[PDB]
Structures are given as C-alpha cells and as structure tokens.
C-alpha cells in the first residue's frame with residue numbers, strides 16, 4: 001500500500017483520485033490509500049508530518065509551499081522522476097521553477113497541475129460597446145479604453161435587464177489578493193522580490209511595481225468596478241459573471257467546463273454569459289505580457305517505507321495519461337506540456353486560448369519564507385484596497401504603504 005494526501009481538487013475529491021490511480025493499482029498489484037485534507041487544515045497537517053516524521057508517502061503541495069517544506073530537509077530528491085518525464089524541456093519555465101527551493105541543486109517536487117489566469121469577457125457586451133477584444137487585451141491603454149466604452153455602453157443583459165459592470169475583481173477579501181496584482185506588477189517591469197548579492201528583498205516599492213499596482217487599483221477608483229465587488233472573493237465574482245452582472249473578469253480554465261454544465265448541476269450553461277463567452281490573455285504592460293501561474297505539485301517524504309514504488313506513482317501521476325484525465329477532473333491545465341495537445345483541450349478554442357496565455361507564464365521565486373512575504377504584501381495591498389474603496393488612493397499613499405510593506409518583508413527575510 002501507498003498513502004497519498006491531496007486537497008479537494010475535483011468535485012468528488014477521493015472518488016476522482018481513486019478512479020485516476022485504479023490503472024496504476026491494477027498494473028503494480030498495490031492499493032493507494034488517499035486522505036483528503038480540507039484547505040483550512042492541509043498546511044498544518046503537512047507541517048506536523050514534516051516535524052514529527054509520521055505521515056503519508058506522497059503529499060500534494062501548493063507550488064508556493066515547495067520552498068518551506070524543501071528547506072525542512074524532509075523531502076526525497078525526484079530528479080530521476082523529472083528526467084523520466086522528459087526533464088526541463090517537458091515543462092513551462094514558470095512550472096519548472098516550482099520543482100525545487102530557489103537556488104537548490106536537487107528537485108524536491110513533481111508538477112501535477114497548473115492554475116493560470118486570463119480574462120473572460122461577454123462577447124455580446126464588447127460588441128454592443130464597439131470594443132474589439134484584440135484591441136482591449138493588446139495593451140494597458142487598450143484595456144482601460146475598453147472599460148471606458150463598456151461603462152458608457154447602453155447594453156443590458158437580456159435576462160437581468162440591467163447594465164453590466166465593466167470589470168469585476170476582488171479587493172482584499174480573497175485568497176489571491178497578490179496573484180490578482182502580480183501580472184500588473186510584472187507587466188510594468190516590476191516584481192514582488194528582487195535578489196541582491198545572494199540575499200532577497202522587497203521590490204514592491206520599486207517605481208515599476210508602483211506603476212503596475214496603481215494602474216490596476218485605480219481602475220476600481222474610476223467607476224469600472226462596482227463597490228460591492230471589493231467585498232467579495234473570486235468564487236463570488238465568478239457567480240456575479242455567471243448571473244450576467246460583469247462584462248470582464250479574470251479566472252482559471254475551469255469556468256469553460258462550468259459554461260457547459262446546467263445550473264442544476266453547479267454550472268451556468270443556460271445563462272447568457274455561457275453562450276457569449278470569450279477568453280483573452282492578460283494585456284501587455286509597458287515591459288511585457290505575463291500570466292500568473294500557481295497550482296499543485298506532489299512530493300515524497302524521505303521517511304517513506306516505499307520510495308521506489310512511490311516514485312513509480314509520481315511518474316504515473318506526472319505522465320501523459322493521468323496528466324490529461326486529472327486536468328479534466330480539476331478544470332486545470334496539465335503541468336506536463338505534451339498533454340496540452342490532447343483532443344480534450346485542442347477541440348475547445350477557449351481552452352486553446354489558455355494554452356496561448358500559458359506561453360507568458362511567470363510565478364514567484366520558490367523561497368523558504370514565501371508565506372511571510374505574501375502575507376505582509378497582502379496586508380498592505382489590503383490597506384491600499386481600503387483607500388480605493390473610499391476613492392482616496394493616490395500614487396503617494398500607495399508608495400507609503402508599499403514602503404511599510406517593504407520594511408517588514410526585508411525584516412522577515
């Protein structure tokens with residue numbers, strides 16, 4: 001037997017994983033036990049397995065968890081598994097970076113699936129405002145000009161009979177506050193952290209990062225984002241878009257599967273939003289186009305009693321067949337690049353657009369103390385969102401907050 005710990009990734013988490021690995025059990029004559037760790041308790045349970053030497057053979061890790069657990073010295077190297085799956089060239093650079101602690105020699109984590117963000121849009125609403133998708137998602141100037149025309153439009157949703165908000169985004173009350181901001185920081189030529197003389201420090205208060213953050217946050221201050229959206233998390237914003245209240249909003253590939261499922265089974269197929277759905281990658285900032293990448297990897301604990309067999313399951317789960325099947329179950333992109341060419345993606349132009357958005361993929365450095373950097377950053381971005389909510393965000397007040405964030409991050413590093 002093998003023990004594997006997963007987070008709730010698919011609609012029926014345990015049943016789904018059991019169906020995924022059944023062919024592996026059959027061909028190797030073993031049983032895979034799965035335990036599903038709810039999101040609230042997953043980190044603490046993995047941390048306790050790390051410090052006590054008691055736990056599974058394999059655990060799922062968020063991509064941003066790899067540094068912290070790798071640094072604890074409890075993970076088995078998996079360079080052999082990654083070679084067997086095709087090595088560095090088999091993965092997007094942003095994904096390959098999540099296979100180790102930043103700067104380490106040995107890989108400690110096998111890519112499993114990628115979460116990435118692009119913009120969904122109402123094809124009917126942009127048509128009715130005289131906006132070409134190609135123009136609005138080409139550049140920052142184009143994006144804001146598009147929201148201006150969308151705000152001025154007399155378009156009504158055929159079901160609500162009400163106007164559409166030009167843009168829906170969460171503020172501070174979501175799990176992805178930094179992820180929402182990151183494409184705007186990067187695209188301005190900035191970054192969250194910068195390496196200097198082998199040490200790491202905050203770049204959040206660099207002029208480039210500030211031009212990025214201000215461009216994004218000021219959109220909600222200029223009447224393109226409803227007040228009520230800033231109170232909500234990404235899941236609730238998805239629901240607003242499904243209900244026909246938003247012309248534009250960012251999320252992952254899973255929305256495409258949902259647009260094909262009836263409301264009665266948790267989809268929105270019947271809604272106008274589903275029948276008039278477009279997808280475009282994030283617009284190009286002044287210094288390039290970037291797509292935020294997260295998701296989950298699998299690691300092998302070095303106290304495991306069946307490392308060789310657990311590595312065969314890592315090759316299985318990371319490899320072409322399981323990569324395709326699990327991406328469909330989770331509504332995510334496969335981590336393995338070669339799985340992108342399977343007909344279940346290639347037959348769906350909206351999925352093909354996510355594949356093209358993937359080409360601009362970037363993620364955060366795999367730092368041991370990434371959790372701390374992200375929490376201090378989000379805390380101060382949260383205070384910036386509060387000023388946006390009151391129409392009182394200025395370039396000067398943002399800089400003051402990102403200075404305080406920088407002082408605290410540099411101390412935690």
Ligand SMILES: [Cl-]
Nearest residue numbers: 191192193364
């Ligand atoms: Cl960064």
